[PDB]
Structure formats: C-alpha cells, structure tokens
Amino acid sequence: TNQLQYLHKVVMKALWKHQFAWPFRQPVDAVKLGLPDYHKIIKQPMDMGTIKRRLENNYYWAASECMQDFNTMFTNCYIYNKPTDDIVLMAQTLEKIFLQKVASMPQE
Amino acid sequence: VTNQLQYLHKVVMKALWKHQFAWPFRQPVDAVKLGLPDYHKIIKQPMDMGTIKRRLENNYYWAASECMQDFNTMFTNCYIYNKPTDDIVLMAQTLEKIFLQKVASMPQ
C-alpha cells in the first residue's frame, strides 16, 4: 500500500540511520549481551531489521500492523531495562521520531 | 483547530476514554494513594488521558503531533515504571493498540 511504502521509505529510513538506532537494527542477542533472563521476560522480540524484512517481503496487510511491530519493539525495551539505562533514552528518542513521521502518513 | 486534532478528539480520545481498561489512565497517577513513593523519582513527565482530553477541549495543542506525543508519554511512563508482569502493562498495551489503529487513519 501507499502507507506501507511511506513506513518503509520515509519512517523506517529516518529511524534506521539515526545515531541511537544501532541497538535496534537487529534482534537483541541475549547470549552476546549476557542476558539469560531476556527471553523469559520478553516473549515477543521485535526489531527494525525484522520489520524492514517484513515490509520488503510484503508480509503486512495494513499500515497499522507494521506500526504495532514498532510499538512492540519500543515497549519491550521499556519493560525489560532499568528506567535509568541509556537504552531507554535511545528508544524514547527514536519513538518520538516515529510518531512525528507517522503523523504525516498518507491516508488510505 | 486542525483536521487532525479534531480526529484525535472525536475518534481517538472518544474510543479510549470510554474503554473498560481506561479508568487507571483517566486522571494523574496519585503516588500517595497508590503507595508509590518512588513514582515521581522515576517518571519525570507524568501524563494521563484527563489532561490530554482537557487540552483537546481547551485548544491547548498547536499540532496533532503534540497531542500524539502526550498519549505516547502516558503509555511509555507506564511501561518504564511498572514491572513486566503487572496487569497495568497489559491494560496500557490494549489501549495503545487502539491508539495506533486509529492514528493510522488520521488525515494527512
């Protein structure tokens, strides 16, 4: 759709290149990061790499569905991490940009 | 008074305000009442639907994005402060899904 094209080419491209985006471009690697409780707490892992691949494989049926995945990614970060962790501030910044760009999305 | 702000008031806020899970969000978190002495130490910008509704009623917002950021802050505060297993997190997620669904059809 026009909306999914906007989410891919306008919203995602703007988040992806951001200086705080690198932790969110691929799944959380709990082994590498040494977080053995990560998958016990976060039951629906999500990241922008997964979202981008879904957008490109025509996985989504509606823009809302893609937006839900972005939300899961941010929510997972807030739920798992300590409120004072830098990663929370990084998610908040990206999330604010996501909403700004979503506000200008085409209507269909 | 913009087309988008009207949508936020008449479609988004209308849908969320009356929801069966909305009650904890209709007024600011009362840390004294709930016995949460650390709430304001962790959450620096409290937000709730009553405040947002008032702002929409009183033409406080200059742009739809500003209102959208208030909704987002309300939900994000809830995910950051509470434990992963708290019911309030599920309630917030249910409301936020509706928020995103409706926002996907907001006028461009």
Ligand SMILES: Cc1noc(C)c1-c1ccccc1
């Ligand atoms: C992203 C993200 N969400 O939770 C954690 C933990 C991360 C993360 C932190 C550092 C590097 C990569 C991912």
Ligand SMILES: Cc1noc(C)c1-c1ccccc1
């Ligand atoms: C909403 C909300 N966010 O954190 C807390 C704590 C609440 C809350 C829980 C029960 C009743 C009212 C607010």
